[PDB]
Amino acid sequence: PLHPYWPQHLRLDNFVPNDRPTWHILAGLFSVTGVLVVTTWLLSGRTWRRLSLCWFAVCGFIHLVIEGWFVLYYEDLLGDQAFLSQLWKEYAKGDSRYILGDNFTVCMETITACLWGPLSLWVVIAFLRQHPLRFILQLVVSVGQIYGDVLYFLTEHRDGFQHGELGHPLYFWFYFVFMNALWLVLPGVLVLDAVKHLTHAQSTLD
Amino acid sequence: PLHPYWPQHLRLDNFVPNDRPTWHILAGLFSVTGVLVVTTWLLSGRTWRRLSLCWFAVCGFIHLVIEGWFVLYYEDLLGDQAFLSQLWKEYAKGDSRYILGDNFTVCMETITACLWGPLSLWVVIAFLRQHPLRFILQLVVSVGQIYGDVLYFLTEHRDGFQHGELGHPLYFWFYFVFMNALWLVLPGVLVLDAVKHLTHAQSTLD
Ligand SMILES: CCN(CC)CCO[C@H]1CC[C@@]2(C)C(=CC[C@@H]3[C@@H]2CC[C@]2(C)C(=O)CC[C@@H]32)C1
Ligand SMILES: CCN(CC)CCO[C@H]1CC[C@@]2(C)C(=CC[C@@H]3[C@@H]2CC[C@]2(C)C(=O)CC[C@@H]32)C1
């Protein structure tokens, strides 16, 4: 095959295999995410909700930098761009169609980068002073994430999983199903959390 | 041309124009919506927030009946079905591609039928103080509606408004821009409402 993307009849000109190996991307992401998690842990310290703050920092980073990189630089598809573009080519080696610049993928991603990145960072920043809007922002960001991800799954399901090889453990099960299921489940828990707290605050008013 | 739908290269066999004229559909929906608004006003009696309740009842009605009708019967869309199917063909004469059964559109519509419809009825029920959840549900539903509508507009914009004639007063400006813009403007205002109240309720933390 000329390319690993599973709709193998795709004739992808301007396609260049990336010079940096995947372990480069893994090391870079692990290090940067560790730095963010540690720094946010310290800022929160100076119990679980501090972990949620670290989660929101990671989310803001992913939405703003990575997904923003996708929204800005499709369809470039040349590994001469940073390990962000190399990362996107690897994930597109996974199930989803991040090479074609699909209308929905670009639109959904632009919304999450422009809004949920900034709003997640606002969740963590304004959470450090226990501000009334905090549970509202946590709920809004988690609803937007759950909604975008549900549309993501629904669209690729009705498309018959055309994009990306089916059943594959790494590319389909870990990349497509698991991580996205994280953005389904974890903000779901956060939704339940924020709802319980906002309900308690609302019940007091009499 | 054999059909009025504007991607004029569309070769739509199995297309049958419905025998009922557009005034049939417009009168039917206008009357049923009047019935709903009046009955909901009476139920609220038994100021502005009562109008918001009537709005949410109308929203639940549209999401459940009309958009679920589309979600179930977006495949055949032959006017030999009730004035709902002809209603969808009439709207599809406008910009959007509700005849092709676009992969993205149905998915989005499914969500609004399955979630924002029932949740709107829960909003109107819970507003008579049956639960603190009334404002939370209002915020969740309005955020979801705004997200669906923004994705709708963005997706049709990147497509260059291919679907549906540009500039057309009735089909583009009234159907596509104006009506949908309601689900842009009104729930946005409603979000502000809940925020003002929810922030004040969260202000209770002392
Ligand atoms: C969050 C938005 N959702 C839809 C809502 C789209 C998915 O966003 C992806 C963003 C990149 C990233 C983290 C993904 C999982 C596996 C990672 C991949 C980055 C590159 C990695 C590190 C490798 O070299 C092997 C494992 C790969 C998730
Ligand atoms: C919020 C969801 N958004 C997508 C994000 C889709 C909006 O749902 C559509 C539901 C049918 C309806 C109301 C539409 C505009 C013009 C209406 C049309 C129905 C038939 C009408 C009444 C006529 O006979 C003349 C005016 C026509 C809006």
Numbering used by the authors:
A (entry chain B), B (entry chain A): 7 to 52, 60 to 219
What does the publication say?
EBP catalyzes the conversion of Δ8-sterols (e.g zymosterol and zymostenol) to their corresponding Δ7-isomers. Here we present two structures of human EBP protein each in complex with a different pharmacologically active compound, revealing its mechanism of action in cholesterol biosynthesis and multidrug recognition. The structure was determined by selenium-based single-wavelength anomalous dispersion (SAD) and refined at 3.2 Å resolution with U18666A and 3.5 Å resolution with tamoxifen. This protein contains five transmembrane helices (TMs 1–5). EBP forms a homodimer in the crystal, as reported in previous solution studies, with dimensions of 65 × 30 × 55 Å.
